[model samples]
Structure formats: structure tokens, C-alpha cells
Target: ATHEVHMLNKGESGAMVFEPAFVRAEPGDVINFVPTDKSHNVEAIKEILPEGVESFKSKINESYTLTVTEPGLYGVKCTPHFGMGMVGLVQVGDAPENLDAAKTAKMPAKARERMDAELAQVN
Candidate 1:
């Protein structure tokens, strides 16, 4: 099945903060991101601390597609809003019901705790 994700901008210039925030895909499924504005870029978040999966970011009006090559959870976030819950989670196979479940499945309490603490400090 194909999935359409909405992209939004946090600024007045019409940027995008990918809506839905998360997606679940299976092998052979294609994920498409459509920009609802004109100021955004798709970027892959590197060095995923809590989870270890490749992520892709998109620019406004830019579209990206990824073929599920493995069965696991991937993490992504907007560079501009990386700290404002602008992150996304993609599952290649059957994923957990929610973020908490997904995090518990893939990340240990220590890692989650660390990130949470860091976010708390930064925000």
C-alpha cells in the first residue's frame, strides 16, 4: 500500500514539519511525502541516539521514497525542529502500537532516559 504524509512549516515562510510524525511500512511498500508549503527540505538524521535506523528528511515540495529493505524501526526528525517533537518514526515491518512501545522495544530505559533528560535540559 502507498502512504501519503503531509509536510508542514513551523515558520511563517511556509516550511514543513512532516505531519503524522511517524509511519509504518512493509517490504515493497513505498512512502511518499507531499509538502503543504514551500520552505522545507528532506534530510536524513544521522547518529540516531535512541534508535539505530536510517532516517530521511524532505524539503518543501520535495518528495522522497524509501523501499523497505529490512524489518526494524527507523527514526527521523526535522533539522529545524529537531527538539520540538518534529521527529518521525518509520517501521519497516509490523511496528508497535505507539511511540512508547516502539521506544521500549528498540531502546533501553537508560538510553531513553538519557535523551529525555537531555531534552528536558535543552528545552
Candidate 2:
């Protein structure tokens, strides 16, 4: 399945958030990041990607599609809005392998707060 995560200027939860900020998918499923508003891009949070997965970054206003082929957690953020907590997580494979490392990955305080909330749903 291809999950579409919309990058919004201001969404239900707050500003600069991805609609459906958390995702879970089996290996081979695709994650589509759609910039629903201007000035938004998706960048893989390298520190928490599954092993052997190359990091990715999307140009502002462009859509980025990632195929999850590894069994682990993939963390991503909107570069310009990261400090404002624009972050999201994708759990690939039934057993997300890097949840612990992802939980401890360093991020701005606000981003961390949002990330932790998303992490809880993984359990």
C-alpha cells in the first residue's frame, strides 16, 4: 500500500504537522509525502533510519515517495519547521527494529516531545 502523509501548514493537531503523523507498514509498502502547502519538505532523520537505507530529502512543494524495504523505524522531519516540532515516524515491518535508538535520537525539545508521543503508539 502507498500511504499518503500530507504536509500541512496548519493541521488538526497544530501548525506545520503532517496529517496522520505516524505510520505503520510492511516491508515494500510505499510512503508518500505530499506537500499540501508551500515551504515544506521532508528529510529523513538519518540517525534513526533502518540499516542500509539511504537518507532522503524532498524539495519544497514536491512530493517524495519512499519505499520501506527494511524492518525498522524511519524518522523524518520538515527541515524549516523542525524546531517547531514538524516531525513524523514510519514503522516498517512488523517488528520495528530501531525503536530504542529512535527514542533516544537527539532532536529539538519540541520535536522530541511530538516524536515521543508518536513512539508510544508503536508499542
Candidate 3:
């Protein structure tokens, strides 16, 4: 039901994170989302989230496309798997305008670490 997922991501560099976790999407771009088994549920980080839409929350195994209209840094995290650094990033347009604010978003140490590493690519 999914082909966008990879069990491993660049060995120790990324750990068991989202394949191509950090991406750049334009408005109207659609995304293929996959979950982390039954234990894992996808959710969006409230802070530094994109505009023009609500947060992402899903519990399914079906394939879908997420249309990206607003341009911002979409910092997503898997609730259950986030403990092991399960996080993702997607930036639109060119630069992350709120990099400092996002970097200061409230979260756990590990998740923050993952976000820091991922956001480093854009910042």
C-alpha cells in the first residue's frame, strides 16, 4: 500500500526516519504519506506549522496525496515513534522565514534534536 517508505535512512546519519524526510514543496504539491505501523500516528507540530490549513492527523494505511498550498516549514512528527527520532521536514518557496521561532518550538529533547538536524539543511 506504500512505496515511499524505507526501513532505514542513510544508516546512522538519519536513523529509522522518514525517507527523504526533508523536502521542498510548492503550493499545490501533493504528498504521499505512510504511517509507522499501528502504533504510530502522524501529526503536525503545532509550532512553526504552515498556514491556510489545520494540522495533519491520520490513522490509516491508504495512499494519499497532500496538496501543499502555503509556503512554510512543515515540521511533522510521529507520536509513538518520535521517541526514537521519528520526524520530518518540508519547506516551501525558498527559505524558512521563521527559522529562529521554529528552532525555539517547545518539544522533547530527542524530537528537538531531530528537528534541529533536519532544519539545519534549510537554515
Best by TM-score: 2
lDDT of 1 by residue, 1-123 (tens): 787766676533122355655566676677676666555545554443224335555554576765555665555555555544445556665532333444443343333433333233221
lDDT tens per residue, model 2, 10-113: 99979889878899888789888887898999999998898899988899989899888888899999999999999999887676778789889999998998
Off by over 4 Å in 2: none
Q: Against the correct fold, how does model 3 do in TM-score?
A: 0.78
Give the poorly placed runs of model 3, Cα more than 4 Å off.
1-16, 35-38, 60-64
TM-score of 2: 0.95
User: Of 1 and 3, which scores higher on lDDT?
Assistant: 3
Model 2 alpha-carbon miss at residue 107, Å: 0.5
Candidate 1 has an lDDT of 0.51
Q: Point out the worst 10-residue segment of candidate 3 by lDDT.
A: 1-10
Give the least accurate 10-residue stretch of model 2, judged by summed lDDT.
Answer: 91-100
Task: Please identify which of the two predictions, 2 or 3, would achieve the higher TM-score against the true structure.
Answer: 2
